[PDB]
């Protein structure tokens, strides 16, 4: 269910970095680790926020009505 707006822990807006993150993975062919750091996510409170997210919405959208 969608990328958390802001990190539970510290509050660093994070919801505006999901797509960026994904791209860095697929095309830039980077490892989750660096991809994160490049997105400015340097502390672990803010790294688990994205690294762990399970974008379930993409599966809820396949339900027609």
């Amino acid at each position: 269910m969608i990328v958390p707006v802001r990190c539970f822990s510290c509050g660093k807006v994070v919801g505006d970095k999901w797509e960026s993150y994904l791209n860095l993975l697929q095309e830039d062919e980077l490892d989750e680790g660096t991809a994160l750091s490049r997105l400015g996510l340097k502390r672990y409170c803010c790294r688990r926020m994205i690294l762990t997210h399970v974008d379930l919405i993409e599966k809820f959208l396949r339900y027609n009505p």
Binding site: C10, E32, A35, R47
Partner: protein, 196 residues
């Protein structure tokens, strides 16, 4: 609860400030008491943290699979390369004061579950509501606004406290209470009550 048989209810929430903090400015989402560890020998819990920390840092899925050659060392070795004390401790400052905490603390990320059964779903509390038609005694369950069971065992305690009056007030004035008329010759409730 963690994933290691260690459940616990919240006891209070603190806002970011009042919380102890990391020099990096990181603060905990949750704080558990060290005392719930020596006895439960639930070490993996500790380990998992060591691991989950390193992992989040290096964006690597932490492998806490059972029978593997994964050591607390190999991990501590990895976490240091990450500029952190090899065990999970991290100097922390007291939110109120800002001063340093004389005792470094085990700080890291740990998978925690949100169990069902939440206070508000339990808080029942009655003060004389509906009673059973058959026994004229308070009804069961809170969905029905019933009463709490002052069963056998509780009674014994009261008896033990020598609090005679209270007892009577509990097994009578609250719950069953009824006035009956009796024949002064054959102690049977066979006296027709015509009150008027």
């Amino acid at each position: 609860a963690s994933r290691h048989g260690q459940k616990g209810t919240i006891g209070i929430t603190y806002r970011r400030e009042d919380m102890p903090f990391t020099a990096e400015g990181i603060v905990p989402d949750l704080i558990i008491n060290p005392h719930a560890i020596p006895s439960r020998m639930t070490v993996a819990h500790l380990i998992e943290c060591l691991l989950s920390k390193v992992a989040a840092l290096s964006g690597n899925e932490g492998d806490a699979s059972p029978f593997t050659d994964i050591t607390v060392e190999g991990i501590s070795k990895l976490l240091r390369e990450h500029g952190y004390q090899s065990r999970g401790f991290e100097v922390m400052y007291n939110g109120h004061t800002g001063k340093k905490l004389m005792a470094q603390i085990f700080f890291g990320p740990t998978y925690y579950q949100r169990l069902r059964h939440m206070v508000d779903d339990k808080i029942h509390a009655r003060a004389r509501g509906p009673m059973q038609v058959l026994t004229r005694q308070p009804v069961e369950g809170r969905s029905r606004d019933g009463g709490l069971r002052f069963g056998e065992m509780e009674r014994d305690c009261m008896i033990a406290h020598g609090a005679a009056s209270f007892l009577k007030e509990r097994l009578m004035e609250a719950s069953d209470a009824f006035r009956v008329h009796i024949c002064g010759i054959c102690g049977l409730m066979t006296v027709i009550a015509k009150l008027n």
